[PDB]
Amino acid sequence: ELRVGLEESELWLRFKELTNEMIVTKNGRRMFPVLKVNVSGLDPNAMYSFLLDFVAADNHRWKYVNGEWVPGGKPEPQAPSCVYIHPDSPNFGAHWMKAPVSFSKVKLTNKLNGGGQIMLNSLHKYEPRIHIVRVGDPQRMITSHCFPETQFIAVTAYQNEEITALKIKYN
Numbered sequence: 001e002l003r004v005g006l007e008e009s010e011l012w013l014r015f016k017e018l019t020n021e022m023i024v025t026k027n028g029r030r031m032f033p034v035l036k037v038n039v040s041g042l043d044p045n046a047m048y049s050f051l052l053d054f055v056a057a058d059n060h061r062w063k064y065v066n067g068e069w070v071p072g073g074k075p076e077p078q079a080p081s082c083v084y085i086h087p088d089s090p091n092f093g094a095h096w097m098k099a100p101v102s103f104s105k106v107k108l109t110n111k112l113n114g115g116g117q118i119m120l121n122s123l124h125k126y127e128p129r130i131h132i133v134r135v136g137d138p139q140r141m142i143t144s145h146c147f148p149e150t151q152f153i154a155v156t157a158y159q160n161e162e163i164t165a166l167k168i169k170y171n
């Protein structure tokens with residue numbers, strides 16, 4: 001009954017086809033595309049919080065060489081666990097289900113700086129993951145959901161000029 005669907009999956013797949021890249025900066029940078037999901041099968045009367053984190057996909061980093069992403073060395077030590085709390089939290093299941101849940105305000109950074117920003121290692125691959133937690137639950141039940149369409153490589157600057165162009169075209 002619980003269903004969490006990626007919105008604009010076709011657009012994400014265009015970026016994923018090229019290998020998607022997300023800029024990280026000292027002060028933090030919002031994502032494009034924005035991660036948005038539709039949710040069904042929550043209790044409309046209950047209250048939930050929506051959380052987001054980013055899971056490392058490989059035991060190595062990457063490098064863009066001759067127009068191709070290739071394994072580019074041993075990984076750096078894993079990034080700190082950073083979780084983003086959706087600012088609508090806590091809210092009724094009715095709230096989360098009446099309209100897609102958008103994580104427009106989350107910012108990716110390469111420094112532990114000011115904010116609820118997400119710390120990522122440049123040239124490493126990550127995948128957004130959403131968690132739903134119910135308030136007042138003595139079992140502290142959490143549901144976790146991964147989105148393979150939204151995988152990307154964190155970068156201090158775009159490597160693929162097709163990514164640079166695509167981000168301008170669709171944004």
Ligand SMILES: Cc1ccc(N[C@H]2CCN(c3ccccc3Cl)C2=O)cc1C(N)=O
Nearest residue numbers: 002041042043044046132133134141142143
């Ligand atoms: C009657 C009723 C009870 C429960 C639910 N939803 C469950 C499943 C997900 N979940 C849930 C619970 C804890 C943490 C995270 C989640 Cl996601 C819930 O609270 C729907 C109905 C209904 N509308 O019939």
